[PDB]
Scaffold this active site. Structure first.
Site, short mmCIF file in Angstrom:
data_model
loop_
_atom_site.label_atom_id
_atom_site.label_comp_id
_atom_site.label_asym_id
_atom_site.label_seq_id
_atom_site.Cartn_x
_atom_site.Cartn_y
_atom_site.Cartn_z
CB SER A 62 -1.39 -0.28 1.00
OG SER A 62 -0.87 -0.51 2.37
CG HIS A 107 -0.64 -5.12 1.85
ND1 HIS A 107 -0.30 -5.90 2.55
CD2 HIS A 107 -0.90 -4.48 1.34
CE1 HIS A 107 -0.09 -3.63 3.27
NE2 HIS A 107 -0.43 -3.30 1.87
CG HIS A 137 6.54 -9.27 8.08
ND1 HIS A 137 5.17 -9.05 9.10
CD2 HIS A 137 7.05 -8.25 7.45
CE1 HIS A 137 5.13 -7.53 8.07
NE2 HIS A 137 5.94 -6.80 7.58
NE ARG A 140 3.35 -3.61 12.88
CZ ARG A 140 2.91 -4.24 11.24
NH1 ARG A 140 1.72 -3.14 11.16
NH2 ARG A 140 3.08 -5.29 11.19
CG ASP A 196 -1.95 -9.33 9.61
OD1 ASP A 196 -2.88 -7.97 9.80
OD2 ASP A 196 -1.68 -9.38 9.45
C1 LIG Z 1 4.20 -13.65 5.84
C2 LIG Z 1 4.89 -14.26 4.88
C3 LIG Z 1 3.27 -14.27 3.93
C4 LIG Z 1 6.12 -14.49 4.70
O1 LIG Z 1 6.08 -14.62 3.64
P1 LIG Z 1 7.56 -15.13 2.83
O2 LIG Z 1 8.26 -14.21 3.35
O3 LIG Z 1 8.08 -15.63 1.43
O4 LIG Z 1 7.59 -16.72 3.55
P2 LIG Z 1 8.84 -17.45 4.19
O5 LIG Z 1 10.49 -16.22 3.47
O6 LIG Z 1 9.49 -18.06 5.53
O7 LIG Z 1 9.41 -18.98 3.62
C5 LIG Z 1 9.37 -20.00 4.09
C6 LIG Z 1 8.43 -21.35 4.76
O8 LIG Z 1 7.88 -20.48 5.52
C7 LIG Z 1 6.33 -20.92 5.42
N1 LIG Z 1 5.53 -20.35 6.95
C8 LIG Z 1 5.81 -19.09 6.35
N2 LIG Z 1 5.60 -18.14 7.86
C9 LIG Z 1 4.35 -19.85 7.99
C10 LIG Z 1 3.59 -20.40 8.96
N3 LIG Z 1 2.93 -19.33 9.92
N4 LIG Z 1 2.92 -21.15 8.94
C11 LIG Z 1 3.51 -22.16 8.10
N5 LIG Z 1 4.05 -22.24 7.00
C12 LIG Z 1 4.92 -20.84 6.98
C13 LIG Z 1 6.52 -20.26 3.97
O9 LIG Z 1 5.12 -20.59 2.75
C14 LIG Z 1 7.53 -21.20 3.21
O10 LIG Z 1 6.87 -22.15 3.19
P3 LIG Z 1 7.82 -23.21 1.58
O11 LIG Z 1 9.54 -22.68 1.17
O12 LIG Z 1 8.49 -24.94 2.48
O13 LIG Z 1 6.88 -22.90 0.44
C15 LIG Z 1 4.04 -15.82 5.39
O14 LIG Z 1 4.82 -16.07 6.67
C16 LIG Z 1 2.39 -16.16 5.78
O15 LIG Z 1 1.81 -16.76 4.72
N6 LIG Z 1 2.08 -16.13 7.04
C17 LIG Z 1 0.93 -16.14 7.38
C18 LIG Z 1 0.00 -15.16 6.95
C19 LIG Z 1 -0.04 -13.64 7.39
O16 LIG Z 1 0.00 -13.02 8.77
N7 LIG Z 1 0.42 -12.23 6.79
C20 LIG Z 1 -0.13 -11.08 7.73
C21 LIG Z 1 1.47 -10.84 7.40
S1 LIG Z 1 1.80 -9.55 5.88
O1 LIG Z 2 5.37 -4.65 5.87
C1 LIG Z 2 4.51 -5.08 5.27
O2 LIG Z 2 5.06 -5.45 3.80
C2 LIG Z 2 2.66 -5.67 4.58
C3 LIG Z 2 2.46 -5.08 5.77
O3 LIG Z 2 2.43 -5.25 7.59
C4 LIG Z 2 2.03 -4.10 7.02
O4 LIG Z 2 2.19 -2.53 5.87
O5 LIG Z 2 1.65 -2.90 7.36
#
Ligand SMILES: CC(C)(COP(=O)(O)OP(=O)(O)OC[C@H]1O[C@@H](n2cnc3c(N)ncnc32)[C@H](O)[C@@H]1OP(=O)(O)O)[C@@H](O)C(=O)NCCC(=O)NCCS
Ligand SMILES: O=C([O-])CC(=O)C(=O)O
EC number: 2.3.3.1
Lengths: 434, 434
Positions: A242, A272, A318, A327, A373
């Site tokens: 964003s 997001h 993250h 947070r 979140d």
């Molecule tokens: C935030 C997020 C998208 C980061 O993704 P990323 O940086 O590409 O992932 P990573 O570098 O940690 O990847 C390492 C592995 O851990 C996994 N992983 C990360 N968080 C995880 C969780 N809470 N539970 C299970 N697996 C998880 C990833 O999917 C990845 O799996 P793979 O390599 O076997 O496919 C991911 O942690 C996630 O999906 N979190 C849950 C949703 C959430 O809370 N989102 C809000 C934050 S913006």
């Molecule tokens: O930091 C990010 O990429 C996503 C996020 O949590 C935010 O915008 O607050």
């Protein structure tokens, strides 16, 4: 003294001169490398842009102009008879880099109340919107339509000097922020209160109190949560979708309204702005597959199977953070105060105990700790804010503060059009081969 | 067969494998450095993203999946006894990589005719917009509100597999493109034709014909120009703000309506799609003081004066291109063939031999030639399209073809969230010391 605009006017030349010098000396200094993997991986790890307002050290969490959440919780002005930081003071800090006095936060509160009038076409458009049009689409469509009010667009057309761009951006931003609670409250009621009126802005109240008034909430504690929520969601570096969107659209010299509108379409995307809702639905299905007051081991199993099913545990991890998001901590503290004996909160706090132990054993996480979140949705549900779809509108209202603060500076410092070079696969392959 | 979806369903595996192999070879290969200057300079010269549909060699111009504009003019299916290439054909090339047959373009015309119905809530919303709300802003709000129609948003909420994302994006994208002219025409008519209705889609006409019919135009040549205009504005790499915004919002898994709407907020920026208008205004200001007729040094004054005043011969240069945009040449050819005895064209042509003299002589420049926008406005004006504010809307409709072709591929290829890293000046200052 209290006039933010003159205070900003004084800061800007110092900052121009400080960057001019810095770029003369170290412009050609290499700060990173770009790989093929980074191009296909969404600029992951790539140092992309300058973003002054806030900075996210992956180890210790977000910092607003050098100040951590805990430091802002203490130093930022509070409402009379309240404990939580006012968003007003956050905004001031992001724009000036200085902690505001009570008087400046009061001044700002009056300015935002005074600029809160909606033009009638925007009222009309929110009121004709159907109930199956998501809150976030309504927010974005209405902000876009508010650009009829843009000073900056009219002034640009008439050939205003570059040196003055930031003044129009500021006015437009103050106008947008002032109006956002009206827009958002009008959406809230039209969807979840049979189109009852938002009422009047009280000229003497703070931004968050008018907002909760217009939402229809009178619980003082919900107003304290709002003030805490709107502060901490305000900014999170430049690279989040964003903020980057608003930065990108801003750089074509699109006015704040269009810039912000674009940011909300970014925030409307699952990856997001929806994790909040994604956590709550799971917590509900958890207490419906294991029941309440369960066992730490029973919980440890659910987590394991989930990861064995190949599904994520929402709210943990993250993109860049590598520790407990402050947070999150922030919200926990507020839960421990005002609702320690809530089923859902105990569950959240229970999941704090287990989930960071797996993921690291799984080996797949890097960040096994929770993000914001994981903890927001149960606070909101606790006070009767149960309409999950609407949650991202709250996030968006918060994130206005961050990105608009920075947009003012982006224009003050004459940041140019964002315009990277792209490559085709076929083109990449030929380029690496040379 | 003629089903674009099945063809695409058979292309995708091959392309996924080809990218898999490439990353397994060269994942960690360095393709560029990031300097401090780049981060301040809006990523200028930085290789940021992969974008498959088009490629801008800074010497020769734009290539759509390899083919140049002339190649596209000779190769692409034209309309019945027409001369100009159909946008439908362009979109097929961008999606498939393959020049379409007449039959494939015929099928695609029909699919878009069948998908062109606007929901009533969008109709209502457009009819209630005031005349002081910019056409670009109407367009962007209307598209956002269309996201109530989104297949992809609904399907994702229900837990649809990743391997199918592209399929829903394809459905959302086809519908949006189909609907865009209706929206654009309704805006045109509500602003400039007293809210007269757009009429009916005709199931046996091309996209551009239905568009002109709905705009209220009935000139065969105007329809031909539209076809050419909508083909050549269709895509221009991923680095431009409208392409990059849609790519960025798209990467949060925001549906194509939200993605495109954010891109229009980006295109609405004066440093992106407002040049078309600037030229026609500046031309008129020239044709006033200097009169319709002009001499070479008559320019030398205006130019040098304007270049010494801080202005610039409008649309006479790019930010990555370093030559004579072939898109101009496309239009010049059209005029000479259709509107030769037109004074303003005669002048534009009379400026094609003179201006080139300076620019390099100034030294403070990069592209000593025109771009696309230097020539579009006069053509439109010739045909009665005199409402300058609307010109960018035509660019918007065009640009849908490029960014949506890429959006399908992005989700198909499983591109992740775009999340670069930002730094403060304060932060950048520390980082260089170490
Ligand atoms: C935030 C997020 C998208 C980061 O993704 P990323 O940086 O590409 O992932 P990573 O570098 O940690 O990847 C390492 C592995 O851990 C996994 N992983 C990360 N968080 C995880 C969780 N809470 N539970 C299970 N697996 C998880 C990833 O999917 C990845 O799996 P793979 O390599 O076997 O496919 C991911 O942690 C996630 O999906 N979190 C849950 C949703 C959430 O809370 N989102 C809000 C934050 S913006
Ligand atoms: O930091 C990010 O990429 C996503 C996020 O949590 C935010 O915008 O607050």
């Amino acid at each position: 003294s209290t006039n933010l605009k003159d205070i900003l006017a004084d800061l800007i030349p110092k900052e121009q001169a400080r960057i001019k010098t810095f770029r003369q000396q170290h412009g050609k200094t290499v700060v990173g490398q770009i790989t093929v993997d980074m191009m296909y991986g969404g600029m992951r790890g790539m140092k992309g842009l300058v973003y002054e307002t806030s900075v996210l050290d992956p180890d210790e969490g977000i910092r607003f102009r050098g100040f951590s959440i805990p430091e802002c919780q203490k130093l930022l002005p509070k409402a009379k008879g309240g404990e939580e930081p006012l968003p007003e003071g956050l905004f001031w800090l992001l724009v000036t880099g200085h902690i505001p006095t009570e008087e400046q936060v009061s001044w700002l509160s009056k300015e935002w109340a005074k600029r809160a009038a909606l033009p009638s076409h925007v009222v009309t458009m929110l009121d004709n919107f159907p109930t199956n049009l998501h809150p976030m689409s309504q927010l974005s469509a209405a902000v876009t339509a508010l650009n009829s009010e843009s000073n900056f667009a009219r002034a640009y057309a008439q050939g205003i000097s570059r040196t003055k761009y930031w003044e129009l951006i500021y006015e437009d931003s103050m106008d947008l922020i002032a109006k956002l609670p009206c827009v958002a409250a009008k959406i809230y009621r039209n969807l979840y209160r049979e189109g009852s009126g938002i009422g009047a802005i009280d000229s003497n109240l703070d931004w968050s109190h008018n907002f909760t008034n217009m939402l229809g909430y009178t619980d003082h504690q919900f107003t304290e949560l709002t003030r805490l929520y709107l502060t901490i969601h305000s900014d999170h570096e430049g690279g989040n979708v964003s903020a980057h969107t608003s930065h990108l659209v801003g750089s074509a010299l699109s006015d704040p309204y269009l810039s912000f509108a674009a940011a909300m379409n970014g925030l409307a995307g699952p990856l997001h702005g929806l994790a909040n809702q994604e956590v709550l639905v799971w917590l509900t299905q958890l207490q419906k597959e294991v029941g309440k007051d369960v066992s730490d081991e029973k919980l440890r199993d659910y987590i394991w199977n989930t990861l064995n099913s190949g599904r994520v545990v929402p709210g943990y991890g993250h993109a860049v953070l590598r520790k407990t998001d402050p947070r999150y901590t922030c919200q926990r503290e507020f839960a421990l105060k005002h609702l320690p004996n809530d089923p859902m909160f105990k569950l959240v706090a229970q999941l704090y105990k287990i989930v960071p132990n797996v993921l690291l054993e799984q080996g797949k996480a890097k960040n096994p700790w929770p993000n914001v979140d994981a903890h927001s949705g149960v606070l909101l549900q606790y006070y009767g804010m149960t309409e999950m779809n609407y949650y991202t509108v709250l996030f968006g209202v918060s994130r206005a503060l961050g990105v608009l603060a920075q947009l003012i500076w982006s224009r003050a410092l004459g940041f140019p059009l964002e315009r990277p070079k792209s490559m085709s696969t076929e083109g990449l392959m030929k380029f690496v081969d040379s």
